[PDB]
Amino acid sequence: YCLEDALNDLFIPETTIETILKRLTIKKNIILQGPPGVGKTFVARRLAYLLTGEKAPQRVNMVQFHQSYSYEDFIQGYRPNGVGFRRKDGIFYNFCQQAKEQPEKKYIFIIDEINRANLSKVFGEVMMLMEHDKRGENWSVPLTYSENDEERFYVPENVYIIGLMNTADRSLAVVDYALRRRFSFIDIEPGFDTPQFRNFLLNKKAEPSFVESLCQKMNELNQEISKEATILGKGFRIGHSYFCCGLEDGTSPDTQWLNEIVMTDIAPLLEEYFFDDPYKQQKWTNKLLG
Amino acid sequence: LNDLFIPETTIETILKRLTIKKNIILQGPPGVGKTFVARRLAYLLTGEKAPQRVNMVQFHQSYSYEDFIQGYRPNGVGFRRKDGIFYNFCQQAKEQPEKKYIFIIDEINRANLSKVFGEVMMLMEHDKRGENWSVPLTYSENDEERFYVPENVYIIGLMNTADRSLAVVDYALRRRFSFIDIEPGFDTPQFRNFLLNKKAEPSFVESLCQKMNELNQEISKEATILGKGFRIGHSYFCCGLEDGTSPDTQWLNEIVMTDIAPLLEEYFFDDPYKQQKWTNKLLG
Amino acid sequence: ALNDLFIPETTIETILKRLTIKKNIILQGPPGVGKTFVARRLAYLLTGEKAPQRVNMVQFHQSYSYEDFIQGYRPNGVGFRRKDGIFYNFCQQAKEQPEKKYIFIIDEINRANLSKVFGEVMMLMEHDKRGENWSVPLTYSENDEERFYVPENVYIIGLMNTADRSLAVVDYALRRRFSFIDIEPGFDTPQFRNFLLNKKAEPSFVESLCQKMNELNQEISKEATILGKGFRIGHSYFCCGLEDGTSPDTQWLNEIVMTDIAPLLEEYFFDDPYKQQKWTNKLLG
Amino acid sequence: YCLEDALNDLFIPETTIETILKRLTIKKNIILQGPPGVGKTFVARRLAYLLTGEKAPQRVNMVQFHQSYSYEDFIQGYRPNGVGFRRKDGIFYNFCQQAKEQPEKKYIFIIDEINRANLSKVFGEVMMLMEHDKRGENWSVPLTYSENDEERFYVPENVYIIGLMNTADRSLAVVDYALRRRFSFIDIEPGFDTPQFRNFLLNKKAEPSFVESLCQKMNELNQEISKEATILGKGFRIGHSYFCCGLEDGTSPDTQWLNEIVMTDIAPLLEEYFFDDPYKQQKWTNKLLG
Amino acid sequence: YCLEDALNDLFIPETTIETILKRLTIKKNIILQGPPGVGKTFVARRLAYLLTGEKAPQRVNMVQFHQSYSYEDFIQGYRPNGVGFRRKDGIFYNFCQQAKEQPEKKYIFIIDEINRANLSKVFGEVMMLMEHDKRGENWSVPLTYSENDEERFYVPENVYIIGLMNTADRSLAVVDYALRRRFSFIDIEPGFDTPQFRNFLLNKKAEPSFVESLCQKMNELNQEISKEATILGKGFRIGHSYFCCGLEDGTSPDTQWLNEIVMTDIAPLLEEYFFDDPYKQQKWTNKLLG
Amino acid sequence: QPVIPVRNIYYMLTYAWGYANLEAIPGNNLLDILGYVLNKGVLQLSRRGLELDYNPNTEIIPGIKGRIEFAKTIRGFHLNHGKTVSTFDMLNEDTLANRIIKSTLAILIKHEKLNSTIRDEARSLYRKLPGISTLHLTPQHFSYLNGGKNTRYYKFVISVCKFIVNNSIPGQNKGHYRFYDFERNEKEMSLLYQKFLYEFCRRELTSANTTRSYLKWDASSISDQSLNLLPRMETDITIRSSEKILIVDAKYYKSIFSREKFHSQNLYQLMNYLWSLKPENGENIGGLLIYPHVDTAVKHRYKINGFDIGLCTVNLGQEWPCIHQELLDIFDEYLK
Ligand SMILES: Nc1nc2c(ncn2[C@@H]2O[C@H](COP(=O)(O)OP(=O)(O)NP(=O)(O)O)[C@@H](O)[C@H]2O)c(=O)[nH]1
Ligand SMILES: Nc1nc2c(ncn2[C@@H]2O[C@H](COP(=O)(O)OP(=O)(O)NP(=O)(O)O)[C@@H](O)[C@H]2O)c(=O)[nH]1
Ligand SMILES: Nc1nc2c(ncn2[C@@H]2O[C@H](COP(=O)(O)OP(=O)(O)NP(=O)(O)O)[C@@H](O)[C@H]2O)c(=O)[nH]1
Ligand SMILES: Nc1nc2c(ncn2[C@@H]2O[C@H](COP(=O)(O)OP(=O)(O)O)[C@@H](O)[C@H]2O)c(=O)[nH]1
Ligand SMILES: Nc1nc2c(ncn2[C@@H]2O[C@H](COP(=O)(O)OP(=O)(O)O)[C@@H](O)[C@H]2O)c(=O)[nH]1
Ligand SMILES: [Mg+2]
Ligand SMILES: [Mg+2]
Ligand SMILES: [Mg+2]
């Protein structure tokens, strides 16, 4: 793999990507926080191939957390093999053994929708181990279900963790401040006002006037969302993905195409963000169309 | 496309959105034929009236990820990993990629949707379908064995707008789902033509639309408490007239006390007078 | 059977118009209304053959679960076996006889979580989705060889009671699939007076008593919040003890006032003894 | 092993370190409460070598409580064997037997993130027995899953226990006051004020003005944190671990490095800390940068 | 076994201990209800040897309750063998069996921290037998796990039951119904304003004036605790055992020694108690120092 | 028997709790105002999302969910009927904080004297929270939440909920409720006022430092060093600045609303606070008496015993911003 191969279609600036790779080599644990629809899932699989420098998926593991995920599933736990129960090496446990075999090559574990699952319960033993300065055999720990003190588990240095956490829900947030320290938090913006996003549109036989008008529209709206931080922070603001996909057929991005999507997706979204104000709903909806 | 009481435009809108987006939510009050729409619609997209391809379920608060996808559950001998319906269903379509296999989810609002779907909440997206996007499941014994949505799968969600729960609002799921509202359709001639094609009075059918709309507008009048989502559906009128009993005002009198009155109670809570008024207004 | 029932014939006719079409029904009323005795006579009425075998009855409680109702794993002498529940066993009996209507009685339904008990099946019992078309494999049905469908012949009756103020609003699940019917106590009805005049009751004693109960049942329902129409007293206490062989009399009534209504009245109000004592004495004279 | 080797790199004052041993040797069970990043995990491994007087891991044991630890896991529980269950002695019971193998040499058991688990549930019988007075054969007690033949477990006198409860998560705090009497609580400060912290930076190619600039701002900020108690209490104040690490490569500490820290980790932490007005974020962020 | 050896060291008045001995001979089921650090566990071992009149371990048995404690372990239950399930007589069952041989000699069972586990789950059926009137073979019952109705178990009258409960938690506001009927609560005072507590210090080279100034403060402090009812009742008040410990070397009492105890035990407890009012912590914490 | 307009009272409560347009509501009485905040306040939360706290649950299920507890499984023989004793984490909104809201709303609906529209909206929300369990509320429930894990926003409505519960009395009917006549009682109104200023001054008077100062008597007694018998003396507020220190004692008296003799009995406390307090800095020592009046504000100065003392008033019922203007003007003059 190579860097520019990824960057061709990527809307985020390279500086952030450079900032990301700068921290990740250091911290080895990161969290990318932004609203849905900005390519968190998109970049993350690409980024692994950059950091290793090789397009090897065997060294990459990708999972999505949720409420029904626990330490028994993740790391280790007793589960039924059949008539007889056995201790089951969890997914992260298995991944780490692979990384030990090849210390040189970087091994990456990708966690989507991290904020849902009860992280303190899930990581547990890992919550201490994953820190960049505490990795290695010197800080080896016996596990909960380890047979004896001698059976111990240590995170290797090569491991890099990538976490994806949406900013839409205040209910589900990483309030665990101790855990917040382990992860280096990288905000991501919708990136409407970028040339690379516009170049993709113009590449898809798009009107330059319509493009710049569109970017201005959302940029103003996004700032309006960011304004009322008491009710809705900048984390709620609309992503670029609604507009991205759907042109694969070859349909030119006319106003009609935009008028359709707004009715189907953005219109109720505005209703929920602004439950009390109907005028504000009509105001912003009509503003995009006119 | 013949007996449907909903405009042809909306279904034409739906068919394009469904083919492109691959996931949709049909949201409206109960009794508008959301089930029959999707069930009709599923047969259209397949091109054949094939029920084996189509599967329908009705979520409920206790429904869980253990039931849906994967889970550890007992056989006669002991416990085993039991592949839930959706994994079994996607595997079935995985055998036959060409045909379009459909999964319908009713009363979606009730359950904690994130919990149930879990892993597939990412995988379900139209672009992220294939082995490249496969992931090992929570209970998967080995990381190498993974689950991926095939391209043929299309999912349709039927949502009741009458029980808003101020517990969990997810705007990320809304990103996956393209939301489509459904109106009752009293005004539509197609609903009216059915009754006039059942030897109804021209005034009686026309009078009904006047009656319900006045009620419906009142329900959608107070946006804060209630909305168009609460307003009354039509399907109650569909059933019960295929026996051979043609419409009459006496027939209307049965349904109002029978069916509509509890709905009114729910909506117009602790306001007997307004129930008495609007109920009696329909009788007039 | 018609004359033996104390409620209006109009409601009795109305139900059959409802149940036959809707196929799912729930009766909500005060305790002591003969909900159990009503349903059986109503169940026998629909079939026309007065068969108890066709009818099966269940009483719900919070512990009641899907394993008891439908299917579950029970210990064998060694190991365990799949054990068919009532409803799974019940309908397959009715599956053989499509023409024959089979009835299921679920008492005190509101106490339990309907979802937990039914599980999958809660959609299949909605009348529109019945028969082979709506087949589903069950949770514990390891193979896909056989699927469970509730046939059209089945009718499901639910006995609920509005007695308790502790009860909050009914679960949303019920409201969709069930048609709610409220039953009056039926004191005013002639059929109840003809059951007491048949026992040589004085019409004055009858009319006074009908006048006596009506004033209380009106008063208990006068309260907006704590005591509603659902609270008001039923007639079942009057049945048992007259046709056994003992004639009606004021002392016989006086015994009944002490028996149930006097403690029952205390629980409903639960605040003022004089209010109870006034009404308790008022019943006596 | 000696104090000079241990306290060579530690940023903590000598004052607490001896005070720690004052409370420990008499009481034998202690808890160190401080915000994350003050070396709680860091010192605890070192302290064990002082009391034994040697750099030995054998007499030391380290574990972390992950809200799924149980009395079956810590002390005595049942584990499946191939087809049928067996009774397995937990880790502490296994640890104590070695500790009483030789009473002369002291044994240390360290529990990180101790606050999380429901300690009354986990310890069970031990909650009384851990205390210094109630040790030895005199207070021998039979366990739950002990054999019918009387076999009793007593906390040996040589054993020392150390606990590490971070002060950020309020909910996860000891409210079993009966248990809080067994332990002695040692507050640990952020460690900014110390010159030993300052000496570390100057030794790593740092300006005293920039160094003294840094220390000045944090302590003011911690007062702003300490000022409130409703939401952000005294304990929330920021640790020094962030600044410690990442400089081994040779990057000198400067506003460029400081700027990376501020935007990347701390500033996200701050917006979650306040989450009422951004201006409070804008103020304190800019103050650090200036 | 002379009372003088037993009762001299004790801080509790001779009135309360004697009253305790009354109900214990009378009812034989007793609960000592007081906050930690007043010697609840301390006295209870002494009372057994007092009543028996001898130092004999066999006639006295001790346990601490916790959530995992159950009927199957306490009384009777099945423990797995390699495959098979074998019944095992539990402690209390085995304990009475020893007591049955010697009905004349008093036998004692000590249950610490009884409230933590619900008695019904453990005792269950035996709460019928446990009560003072319904004891003896007359009320004999066959157990749940008895193979046949023939074998029966009765609590002989000789056994006395002692229960130690701490009033430090909000959950205990709803005292368990099972305990109140069958056990008789007795309150253990903190016992600062006592001669023997004072006399303990005076013997250990303590200034008399320093002692009395302290007791007035603690008695004043506990008065503030008890006045509240919403958060902290009278039962939350401080015990007398923080100060007892740490003088075994012979180090003289002084304000210096007091400060270590205050800062390491009582102040953070007060932070836990008086979370809402930092100044109240400052008010009392500094008050002791003066 | 004149009292404050009810709308103004809400502002001081806000400062008391430390965290708007009320022109919209037409019900002047307090409970109409207070409910509208709560009823709307909950709606603000739901938009962002209510708190979901993982409650671990140990229950008997027919399969593996989370962590199996081997002991209870074998002891109860649940393997035989295909069940396990397992610990897992259901995610609920059924926490104590959220339960209080619904239970509080029940009393809100039950209140006899209330705007119908408010009751209409509340009954809607009461239905909209089905999963959460009703409760019979006590102060101990609020007490358990003093830890305050919850957000800054949640603590606001709960503080509102605390006011309602404590100030709720059953009325005509056994079930229904009737609101307390809060304004009529002086002690709580005064205790509001004393607390109102302390939190208020921290906001606006950033220039000065605001502290409540505990004092020790200058007395010595041969009998006792403790002086427990002596009254406990804690200032209401002290507002210290480098140039001048200043103490305020403020209380609500009924007599003062009548414009005659004057009730200044609290003043007797003040001098002794000045006396026992000794400043090392020796910049200055000042005192203030401030009371609430309805019509008008009058300011006086005094030089009594080497102390500089002011009596001043505020015309509550005027307007909140102009009232806010007046206070900043007031403290500025005397502080200087
Ligand atoms: N072609 C293209 N698509 C992009 C780009 N960035 C984001 N997208 C698209 O946006 C969609 C979602 O990507 P994703 O990472 O899942 O967004 P997200 O923020 O993680 N969503 P969520 O948080 O809900 O999981 C995909 O269609 C993805 O390809 C981009 O730079 N180029
Ligand atoms: N060199 C040196 N590093 C220190 C010192 N104090 C803390 N650190 C460093 O700060 C980082 C974290 O320390 P740590 O013990 O884990 O803090 P913690 O309180 O245990 N972390 P947490 O509360 O999150 O569990 C490590 O790099 C640690 O070495 C110190 O005095 N000297
Ligand atoms: N010398 C002496 N020590 C006492 C006296 N009372 C209590 N202590 C000491 O206080 C310490 C703890 O007593 P203990 O009974 O365990 O208190 P507890 O109520 O059991 N504690 P908890 O409630 O936490 O379980 C022991 O050192 C005990 O000897 C006393 O009167 N004299
Ligand atoms: N012909 C016709 N029948 C309809 C229409 N809508 C609903 N029905 C019928 O109404 C009955 C009940 O529909 P149902 O799915 O239960 O209502 P819903 O789920 O609340 O939308 C079925 O017979 C439907 O096919 C319609 O638009 N046209
Ligand atoms: N003969 C006769 N008995 C009735 C009638 N209605 C109720 N009963 C009697 O009342 C009793 C049942 O009352 P019921 O309310 O169901 O008891 P509950 O279920 O505990 O509330 C039986 O004795 C019934 O036979 C009736 O109409 N005719
Ligand atoms: Mg995504
Ligand atoms: Mg640490
Ligand atoms: Mg004890």
Residue numbers in the entry:
A (entry chain C), D (entry chain B), E (entry chain A): 168 to 457
B (entry chain D): 174 to 457
C (entry chain E): 173 to 457
F (entry chain M): 3 to 21, 28 to 267, 272 to 348
Task: Copy the relevant paper text.
McrBC is an antiphage defense system of Escherichia coli that specifically cleaves invading DNA that are methylated. Furthermore, upon binding of the endonuclease McrC, a higher oligomeric form—tetradecamers of 12 McrB and 2 McrC protomers—is formed. GTP hydrolysis by McrBC bound to a recognition sequence powers DNA translocation, and convergence of two such complexes on the DNA results in nucleolytic cleavage. Here we present the structure of the AAA+ domain of McrB in complex with McrC at 3.6 Å resolution using cryo-electron microscopy (cryo-EM), which reveals the coupling between the endonuclease and the motor and the mechanism of activation of the GTPase.
The two protomers of McrC in the McrBΔNC complex are related to each other by a two-fold symmetry. The dimeric interface mainly constitutes helix H9 and has a total buried surface area of ~3000 Å2. The catalytic residues, Asp244, Asp257, and Lys259, are located close to the dimeric interface and aligned along the FA interface of McrB.
